[PDB]
Design a protein around this nucleic acid. Structure first.
Ligand SMILES: [K+]
Ligand SMILES: [K+]
Ligand SMILES: [K+]
Ligand SMILES: [K+]
Ligand SMILES: [K+]
Ligand SMILES: [K+]
Ligand SMILES: [K+]
Ligand SMILES: [K+]
Ligand SMILES: [Mg+2]
Ligand SMILES: [Mg+2]
Ligand SMILES: [Mg+2]
Ligand SMILES: [Mg+2]
Ligand SMILES: [Mg+2]
Ligand SMILES: [Mg+2]
Ligand SMILES: [Mg+2]
Ligand SMILES: [Mg+2]
Ligand SMILES: [Mg+2]
Ligand SMILES: [Mg+2]
Ligand SMILES: [Mg+2]
Ligand SMILES: [Mg+2]
Ligand SMILES: [Mg+2]
Ligand SMILES: [Mg+2]
Ligand SMILES: [Mg+2]
Ligand SMILES: [Mg+2]
Ligand SMILES: [Mg+2]
Ligand SMILES: [Mg+2]
Lengths: 123, 130, 123
RNA sequence: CAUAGGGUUUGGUUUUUGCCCAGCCUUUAGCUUAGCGUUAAGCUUAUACAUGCUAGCCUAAAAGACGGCGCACAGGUGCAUAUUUUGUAAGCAUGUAAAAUA
RNA sequence: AAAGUGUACUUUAUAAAGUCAUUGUAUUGCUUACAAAUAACUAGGCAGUUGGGUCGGCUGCUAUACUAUAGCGCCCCAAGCCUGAUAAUUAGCUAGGCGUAACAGCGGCAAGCCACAGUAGCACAUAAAAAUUGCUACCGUUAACGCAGCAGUAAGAAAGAUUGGACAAUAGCUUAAGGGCAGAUCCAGGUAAGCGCUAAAAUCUUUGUG
RNA sequence: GAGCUCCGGCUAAUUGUGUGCCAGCAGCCGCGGGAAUACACAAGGGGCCAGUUUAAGGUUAAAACAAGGCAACGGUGUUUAAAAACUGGAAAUGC
RNA sequence: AGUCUAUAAACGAGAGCUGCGGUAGCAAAACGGAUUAGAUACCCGUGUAGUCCCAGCCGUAAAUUAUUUAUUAAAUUAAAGCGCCUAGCGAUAUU
RNA sequence: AAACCAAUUCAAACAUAAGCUUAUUGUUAACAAGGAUGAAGUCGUAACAAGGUUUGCGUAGGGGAACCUGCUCAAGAUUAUGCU
RNA sequence: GCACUGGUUUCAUAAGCCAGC
RNA sequence: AAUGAUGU
């Protein structure tokens, strides 16, 4: 650009979007489950992945993935949601933190207990 | 700052008033250049005879009105004003007589020579002062 | 940033005051010329003139620094030292010692423990 | 006291553009956690508030403020404000004027 | 003026002093210029609006400068003034601070300036002043109150500490009889920034025994 | 000594058993269809350490004033043109 | 007496629209005959608007190579003033 | 005292909080459309070779759908037998 | 009739086919 | 001479 163009607002700073817009720049958000069901992934994968529809405390509704093996989530259950995208599931951009208010940890887990909300066995 | 300015007269429509334009520059740290800007100032004219197009000098003064806080001190250049009567006389002189190719060229040469001779004398005087 | 004041107060007095600049139970003081009615550690000053370390060192002495020329200048202008500053100036020999009034109140029997609950817990 | 890159686009190569990762600084969540000394600190609501406390001291025209001095100092917040402000620079007449010392 | 003055007040077989009242060479200051985020899918804006003349603009008590901020207000007179103007969105500003070789970018800590105290209009308060001063209307609870003072409670939120001790020190208010007041401040309690040290005994540390 | 996390490649660190495109993993490329160093568990090993590993913000990994393109895709249909910026030029007439 | 253009204006293929005049040849649409599993297309026969003249409207093209100075056969090199682009995808959004 | 200061009282003027209207700010709606995505439905074969009628731009008309036809234009069309 | 289950098939799946219900 | 299922 010429000197004149630069002076007259020639350059504009690039703007980048967030990956979890529903969190409103917050690490976590509380919500209540509306529906719990399963969905199939895209090609070339094949499985029945567990997902739930949650309404956040700010009024937004998003799809959340439930990690681990098995869950006790039903409709009208309080959960805590964080960022994180499941690549094979289209439209799922959030995950449920396990071990918190209503969700419980995976039974029988021995490794990576922290990521699945399992306490250290005292026995 | 803003004690004194030199600018051009852009409005003489007020009673004992005038508007003067000023040029100045501002440093832009990010692009390392000077940006040219302009401003307008209203000044008090006691003579009340300024002409649009004059170059004048204004100086800081006590506030006189809402937008007038300067006074005109001096005029550095007077704007030209068309005068029909003088122009008509010049046209009559030009049409009074005509010269041929040779006569006009010779007259032009003589006039240049006389101007050159006087200029040389002035330059020598300047060197003598040095 | 902290440009020193130049105009003298019109409705208050100038004083020479001690400013607390220590640590927990490690006092340290700076002497400055400040308006009488202000915050203790306000940034409004006319000049910093000295420092004082009230605790003893290995040599058994306390250490005090002061500008001899500027102290006289501000005393002439009208700056009034506080009670403690008078003591420092009196001992340092800048000005004669200021007499103190007679005392009749029975002195405090708990001066270094009354205000320290940690000691009282052991007591 | 002075400028470091790697992964990826499936015939090969070259080239252009996009995407992801490694540092430092700052808050929460899961699991886990003996003690002492100390530095810097209380990062969402100008949402609604039970209770205690934060500014009084002195004197007296008949034992009492009505009078004097303070509350023009401290402490809290950032609603409003694009300029009313903030950050800087500049300007504003005179031997300070009178009188026999005849 | 860290001063002078008094048909004034208080203390004294010991007296120096302070208290109250009053006093300053003009008797507490206005103005201008430059810089500082987006923004044209905001193109016209202004009529007290731009300029000129008379009058007003108080709180006296040196003398001149031919009246010595100002459309700040009334009356009259001339048509001018602005034009990236006008209208919108967002934000307390400076700066310490964090990343970067720098340029640039972003805005937790100490301090300075400005604004505000449930909302709005007013009276005092000029010159250094309204959280803890008044009047009126309105909003929310119940004629009253408004914790954005310290501690504390409820709701909201992913996430916000004790209804603690002391005036011993620093700073401040009052007081000549040497005192009084204080959630400023200094200390303690609570919360895995950070920094330092301990978590094993040893001729009972030859810095010993004698 | 004590916990948290990781061991296909980027990136320091492997064997066994179970599962059989199921259950699940995943920052990116991607793993699982009966012979899995990538899923679950056991052992062994790597990193950091009273801490450790996600998530969410500021900045860097040259968005280009120092310093990018219109030659992968972008110069607009053409000309005239009293703001601004930069800056001297070879014109008119007659058979 | 210049370069460039923020802003503003004029000129502007073919098709299309309104009125007036003209209509040979050609030819959207339309109607028949064939081809083909189907032919709603390509091929053959007829054939209206249109193509033409005058007066208005519309302002759109795969509507040429960016403009200027110096050098140069070009090129290359260095400057002056602008417009446009910042992964793709997606509106008859609103004004 | 006819002056000044501190009060009570009625009257007139001034502006104003409050108050009224206001575009259209947001919520909301039967219904009719559009776009994006989804391991293995259906009809045709439009483009890529001369793609089997060269491709495409502007505009008009027509067709279940891709597409087809008229008018000018672009090449983003690579195109082999002179003379007498 | 479909539906459902199993077999067949394949590297695996879908479809197809076959049998039962 | 219309058609050529998915994954690798
Ligand atoms: K698992
Ligand atoms: K807050
Ligand atoms: K007094
Ligand atoms: K207010
Ligand atoms: K065009
Ligand atoms: K045309
Ligand atoms: K064309
Ligand atoms: K580009
Ligand atoms: Mg794991
Ligand atoms: Mg670094
Ligand atoms: Mg007193
Ligand atoms: Mg604000
Ligand atoms: Mg108020
Ligand atoms: Mg105050
Ligand atoms: Mg409140
Ligand atoms: Mg509080
Ligand atoms: Mg004191
Ligand atoms: Mg933690
Ligand atoms: Mg390795
Ligand atoms: Mg790995
Ligand atoms: Mg594993
Ligand atoms: Mg065909
Ligand atoms: Mg075809
Ligand atoms: Mg074709
Ligand atoms: Mg052409
Ligand atoms: Mg088919």
């Amino acid at each position: 650009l010429t000197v004149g163009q630069l002076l007259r607002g020639g350059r504009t700073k690039k703007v980048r979007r967030s990956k979890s817009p529903a969190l409103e720049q917050c690490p976590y958000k509380k919500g209540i489950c509306l529906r719990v069901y399963t969905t199939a992934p895209k090609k070339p994968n094949s499985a029945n992945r567990k997902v739930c529809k949650v309404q956040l405390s700010n009024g937004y509704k998003v799809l959340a993935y439930i990690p681990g093996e098995g869950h006790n989530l039903q409709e009208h259950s309080i959960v805590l949601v964080r960022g994180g995208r499941t690549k094979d599931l289209p439209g799922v951009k959030y995950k449920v933190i396990r071990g918190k208010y209503d969700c419980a940890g995976v039974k029988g887990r021995k490794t990576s207990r922290s990521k699945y909300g399992v306490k250290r066995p005292k026995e | 700052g803003g004690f004194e300015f030199v600018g051009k007269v852009v409005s003489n429509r007020m009673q004992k008033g005038v508007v003067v334009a000023v040029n100045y520059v501002v440093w832009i740290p990010k692009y390392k250049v000077y940006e040219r800007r302009t401003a307008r100032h209203m000044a008090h004219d006691e003579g009340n005879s300024c002409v649009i197009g004059d170059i004048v000098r204004i100086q800081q003064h006590r506030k006189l009105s809402k937008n007038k806080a300067y006074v005109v001190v001096s005029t550095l250049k007077h704007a030209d004003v068309y005068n029909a009567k003088q122009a008509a006389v010049l046209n009559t002189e030009r049409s009074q007589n005509k010269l041929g190719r040779v006569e006009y060229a010779e007259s032009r040469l003589s006039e240049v020579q006389q101007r050159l001779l006087k200029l040389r004398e002035m330059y020598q005087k300047e060197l003598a002062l040095n | 940033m902290n440009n020193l004041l130049t105009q003298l107060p019109k409705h208050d007095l100038l004083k020479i005051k001690l400013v607390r600049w220590g640590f927990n139970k490690k006092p340290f003081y700076v002497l400055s010329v400040m308006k009488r009615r202000q915050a203790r550690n306000s940034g409004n000053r006319y000049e910093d003139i000295g420092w004082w370390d009230p605790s003893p060192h290995q040599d058994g002495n306390s250490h005090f620094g002061i500008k001899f020329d500027r102290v006289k200048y501000w005393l002439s202008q009208g700056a009034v030292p506080t009670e403690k500053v008078y003591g420092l100036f009196g001992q340092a020999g800048i000005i004669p010692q200021k007499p103190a009034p007679p005392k009749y109140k029975p002195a405090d029997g708990n001066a270094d423990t009354k205000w320290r609950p940690e000691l009282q817990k052991n007591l």
